[PDB]
Structure 1
Amino acid sequence: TTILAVSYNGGVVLAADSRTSSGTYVVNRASNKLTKLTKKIYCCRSGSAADTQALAERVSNYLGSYQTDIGAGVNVATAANLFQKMCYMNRWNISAGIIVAGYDPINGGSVYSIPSGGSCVKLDYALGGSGSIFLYSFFDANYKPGMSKSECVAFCQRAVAHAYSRDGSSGGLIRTITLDADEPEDQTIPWNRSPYCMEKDPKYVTQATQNQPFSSSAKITGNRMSST
């Protein structure tokens, strides 16, 4: 899993790969890990599909009740707070990295990370999933904040692609959604138009030279490609 969210001026992007794996087999290659909580507030789920689907459904339910009751929009902080509560109450029995991100008119776009222990941290961007370990340096090196919506979408797609090109546990599509004052725009990049992969990076086209032919010299030539 690779999930992330990034703020831009006036909203957020969420992004995720689509793969759900039972270890080394892919049970679902088109999962949707961007889960709607309210109209403009989403979570990205990582960890146990079961656990995260159960919490998201629970929180989305509570939040719809709550919106009907106060007769007004919900804040992202409220959604994060609830998520945090539930994640923390059940921290021993669930595996669950969440990101809660969305747009509310009081605070603009926000991002909260709620990692396994049930901390809740408000950030500019957040990463989660097994694939996130690959993006920390990518962000450190290549993410400048203050990006436009469209730049930010493309950057999150790149970021996911980089992650899932190295994490065996992430893969497939890249789903994104933006969340701001306007209508949510979901997007889905199929793998074969991924903005990065190792199988198409020109610096990984030359094969490692492992299968040298038997020679009278130490000079390395190439792999032996043919018997003759």
Structure 2
Amino acid sequence: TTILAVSYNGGVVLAADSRTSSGTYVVNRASNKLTKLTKKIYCCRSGSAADTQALAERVSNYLGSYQTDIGAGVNVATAANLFQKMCYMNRWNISAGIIVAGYDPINGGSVYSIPSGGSCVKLDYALGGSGSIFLYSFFDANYKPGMSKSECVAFCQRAVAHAYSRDGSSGGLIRTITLDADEPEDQTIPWNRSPYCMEKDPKYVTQATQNQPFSSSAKITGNRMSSTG
């Protein structure tokens, strides 16, 4: 699982892979890990699918009633607090890493990370899942804060592609959603149109020289790909 959220000037972009895997078999290759909480607030879920689904459904139910009670919109901080409380009271029984990202008219675009421990950190960008470990040095080198909306979406897709190119537990479709003062816009790009994969990378085209032909010299001359040669 690879999930991330990046804030730009207007709002936020949430990106995720689509792969639910039972260890080494792909149970689902078209999952949707970007779960709607309110109209402008979403969460990226990593870990136990049942636990994260139940947590998201409960938080969405709580937030929907709260809008009717107060008669106004909900800030991203409220949803972040709801997840933080619900994950902290159940931290020993659930396996969940949550990213709460959204737009509210008061604080603009917000991104919150709630790891397995149950804390809540407000960040410019957040990463999560097994494939997030591959992206940290990718963000330290290639990520510049202050990108435009389209630039942020493209960077998020490229980061997700780079993450699941190396992570066996991640892969499949790349799903992104943009949340800002305008209408939220989703996008799903397939693997065959992904911004990066090692199969299309020209520097991994040449195979490692492992199957030496039987030769009278120590000179390495490529792999043996024929019986005669």
Q: What range describes the TM-score normalised by the shorter chain of this pair? A: over 0.9
Whole-Å separation in 1 of the counterparts to 2:64 and 2:191: 34
Once the two structures are TM-superposed, the CA of residue 10 in structure 1 deviates from its matched residue by 1.4
* Deviation digits for residues 8-61 of structure 1 (CA, Å, limit 9, x no counterpart): 001000000000000000000000000000000000000000000000000000
Aligned length: 228
- Cross-structure match for 1:135: 135
Once the two structures are TM-superposed, the CA of residue 63 in structure 1 deviates from its matched residue by 0.3
SS of residue in 2 equivalent to 1:38:
coil
- Cross-structure match for 1:47: 47
User: Larger deviation: 215-224 or 125-134?
Assistant: 215-224
* Deviation digits for residues 80-133 of structure 1 (CA, Å, limit 9, x no counterpart): 000000011000000000000000000000000000000100000000000000
SS of residue in 2 equivalent to 1:118:
coil
TM-score (norm 1): 1.00
Whole-Å separation in 1 of the counterparts to 2:79 and 2:164: 28
Once the two structures are TM-superposed, the CA of residue 198 in structure 1 deviates from its matched residue by 0.4
* Deviation digits for residues 179-202 of structure 1 (CA, Å, limit 9, x no counterpart): 000001100010000000001000
Give 5+ residue unaligned stretches, structure 1: none
Once the two structures are TM-superposed, the CA of residue 74 in structure 1 deviates from its matched residue by 0.5
Once the two structures are TM-superposed, the CA of residue 66 in structure 1 deviates from its matched residue by 0.5
* Deviation digits for residues 139-172 of structure 1 (CA, Å, limit 9, x no counterpart): 0000000000000000000000000000000000
Runs of 4+ aligned structure 1 residues displaced above 2 Å come to none
Whole-Å separation in 1 of the counterparts to 2:212 and 2:52: 49
Whole-Å separation in 2 of the counterparts to 1:198 and 1:42: 31
Whole-Å separation in 2 of the counterparts to 1:6 and 1:194: 19
Whole-Å separation in 2 of the counterparts to 1:200 and 1:216: 36
Whole-Å separation in 2 of the counterparts to 1:216 and 1:68: 83
Whole-Å separation in 2 of the counterparts to 1:197 and 1:78: 38
SS of residue in 1 equivalent to 2:37:
strand
Whole-Å separation in 2 of the counterparts to 1:55 and 1:158: 29
Q: Among the aligned pairs, what percent are the same residue?
A: 100
- Cross-structure match for 1:19: 19
- Cross-structure match for 2:9: 9
Once the two structures are TM-superposed, the CA of residue 207 in structure 1 deviates from its matched residue by 0.2
Give 5+ residue unaligned stretches, structure 2: none
